[PDB]
């Protein structure tokens, strides 16, 4: 309200490509967490429920990052069989 306008969340259109400008803006708001934050703010999440989800999300990220690391590590040996026939 008290800030300058046309600086925050503002994307310029290139060569009249408004679809790409809108997608860029949508990607910015998504990465910064705004799109998902507006949605969660439509109805009140009860504090006990917010902690439960924030803890589930935190643990799914740790589990997915750890499962990706394991697959990458064990994919080094995906090469062809060096001792075929034995």
């Amino acid at each position: 309200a008290k800030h300058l306008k046309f600086i925050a969340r503002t994307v310029m259109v290139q060569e009249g490509n408004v679809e790409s400008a809108y997608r860029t803006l949508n990607r910015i708001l998504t990465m910064d967490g705004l799109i998902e934050d507006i949605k969660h703010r439509r109805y009140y999440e009860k504090p006990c429920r917010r902690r439960q989800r924030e803890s589930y999300e935190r643990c799914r990220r740790i589990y997915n990052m750890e499962m990706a690391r394991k697959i990458n590590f064990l994919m080094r040996k995906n090469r062809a069989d060096p001792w075929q026939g034995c």
């Binding site: 925050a8 969340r9 503002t10 910015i28 708001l29 910064d32 967490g33 705004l34």
Partner: peptide
Amino acid sequence: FVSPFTGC
């Protein structure tokens, strides 16, 4: 260390 578009 803040977002250019949102200040986050």
